[PDB]
């Protein structure tokens, strides 16, 4: 039933795209790379995400499948490549759930600073497990309402920031362009800080690439693709740019209340801080509670999605058969147990601190997302090259790309350099060891090992250009 208005679909997409990067990670990014560097990094990440999502939408429009981009990777490059991509996606979702739990524990502070957050995290995990094991019937309505609330609070924050920056209400001065130029230039640090915050910028924009897959369900994508592309792209870019600009201008970079490895005291989200420092009491608590509820809902939704995708993967012959067993109600049990066991990683805050664990989880999630983006870009490039070699007419494609091969190449190069320049200084110095390399780069060795093992155990090679599936299938 397509009874929902186009505005309703647009706002649902906006709510789904908005995550925890703008709520918490924005302050850390501003404190690390400054306002201008963060703006440039986010603009580049947005352009790359736009190109990748356009290519994915074209791929979905040309040939629709029910196995997502994993099937394309398996059938266009190699089966082991798709297997590794699927396992990396599952691990990325698990790391995202762990990061959501850590963020909930962190934002739980500033109200009761005299009690460890381990108990709160354990209680939240238990509540999520109970909700997942009882039923999952109210998922859609709760998700829609939470997305609406998130959109409302984001637009309220944008409006109040725009009212404050110029200065209309009494009792507060107008900072103007003073917090921007102070000591160091807005562009602070350099190449190292830029590539460091590039991981966070990429993590923030992850999850919005799947909308094109939804656009693959349209009967006539020819006119449906441009409208959705324009609406979603423009709205997301405008909201992100305005929010980041407001946060950077209204908050100095040298703020002790921002997330860092060495923190003098507790850290709070910029959204709460704006109301707290504005002199309006009894108003930051409601926003903090809304943030907590949104984080809890996002974590529950992610856990449900990870359990469902693990069950779907176990349905085929990839995963071992000791996962598809279901109870009398049909709800999987082994997959939920595995998800809980993997998500129990959030208990290391009591032994390694709060900021470091959150940063490591963000880095791991960003690296997994970057690996997935590289895989999908390579698959799209190989598919287009094979179609061109096959001699098929270009007008038969329902959709296409503007600049080729400028799209796939630029995104691939940018992603590769961002991934490689994260910890380049380790090899420069005399100290090499293995602690830093293992701490920073952990998804790449696992991906390489899985791919090598699958190739050795299956004896498979690349797919010839003249021997590939070209004719689309109708479902």
């Amino acid at each position, epitope marked *: 039933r397509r009874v929902l208005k186009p505005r309703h679909l647009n706002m649902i997409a906006i709510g789904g795209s908005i995550g925890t990067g703008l709520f918490v990670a924005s302050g850390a990014t501003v404190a690390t790379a400054g306002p201008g560097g963060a703006l440039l990094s986010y603009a580049l990440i947005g352009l790359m995400v736009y190109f990748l999502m356009t290519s994915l939408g074209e791929m979905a429009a040309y040939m629709p499948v029910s196995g997502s981009f994993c099937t394309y990777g398996s059938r266009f490059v190699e089966d082991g490549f798709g297997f590794a991509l699927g396992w990396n996606y599952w691990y990325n979702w698990a790391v995202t759930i762990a990061a959501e739990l850590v963020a909930a524990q962190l934002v739980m502070s500033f109200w009761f600073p005299e009690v460890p957050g381990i108990y709160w995290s354990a209680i939240f995990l238990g509540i999520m497990f109970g909700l997942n094991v009882i039923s999952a019937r109210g998922f859609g309505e709760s998700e829609f309402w939470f997305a609406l609330i998130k959109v409302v609070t984001v637009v309220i924050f944008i409006g109040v920031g725009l009212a404050t920056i110029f200065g209309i209400m009494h009792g*507060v001065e107008s900072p103007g362009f003073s917090n921007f130029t102070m000591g160091d230039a807005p562009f602070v640090g350099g190449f190292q800080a830029m590539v460091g915050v590039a991981m966070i910028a990429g993590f923030s924009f992850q999850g919005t690439e799947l909308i094109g897959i939804a656009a693959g369900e349209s009967e006539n994508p020819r006119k449906n693709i441009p409208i959705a592309i324009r609406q979603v792209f423009w709205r997301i870019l405008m909201f992100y740019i305005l929010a980041i600009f407001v946060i950077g201008m209204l908050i*100095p970079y*040298t703020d002790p209340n921002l997330l860092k490895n060495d923190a*003098s005291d507790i850290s709070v989200s910029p959204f709460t801080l704006l109301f707290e*420092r504005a002199g309006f009491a009894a108003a930051a608590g409601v926003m903090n509670a809304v943030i907590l509820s949104a984080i809890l809902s996002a974590g529950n939704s992610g856990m449900y999605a990870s359990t469902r995708m693990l069950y779907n993967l176990a349905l085929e012959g990839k995963a071992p058969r000791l996962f598809s067993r279901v109870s009398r109600s049909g709800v999987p049990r082994n997959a939920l147990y595995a998800t809980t066991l993997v998500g129990a990683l959030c208990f290391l805050t009591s032994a390694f601190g709060d900021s470091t664990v959150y940063t490591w989880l963000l880095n791991t999630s960003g690296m997994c997302g970057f690996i997935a983006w590289l895989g999908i870009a390579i698959s799209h490039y190989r598919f287009r090259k094979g179609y061109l070699a096959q001699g098929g007419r270009l007008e038969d494609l329902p959709y296409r790309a503007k600049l080729f091969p400028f799209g796939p190449l630029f995104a691939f190069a940018l992603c590769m350099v961002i991934t490689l320049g994260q910890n380049y200084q380790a090899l420069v110095g005399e100290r090499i060891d293995w602690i830093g390399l293992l701490a920073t780069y952990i998804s790449l060795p696992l991906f390489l090992a899985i791919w090598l093992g699958y190739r050795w155990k299956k004896r498979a090679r690349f797919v010839r250009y003249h021997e590939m599936d070209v004719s689309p299938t109708n479902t």
Partner: nanobody
Amino acid sequence: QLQESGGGLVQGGSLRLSCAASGRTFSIYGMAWVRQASGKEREFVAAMPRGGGTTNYADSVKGRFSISRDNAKNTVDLQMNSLKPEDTAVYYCVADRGFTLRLGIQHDYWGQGTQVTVSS
């Protein structure tokens, strides 16, 4: 809310004074030090954000006092050099809340203060 320490009797050398804050302080922007004499109008001395990107002084005391912060005790320190008998007064460590470094002799939060006197 605010505490000051380091005062005493100085013959005219150099001395550092420290100011510390109580809990919360997550709704604040930057601190300042303001002097006043016995039965005299309050006079601004120095101001600085907690993070510390700029410092603001007074015209008559430019180039002689240095205001900074210390992470060992997480306290705002002011070093006074070339102290003179004309500076005998009581200092108040204050702070302001907002988005801009507020100047002037008017502030919201006030402390106990410390009296400094110089002998010949």
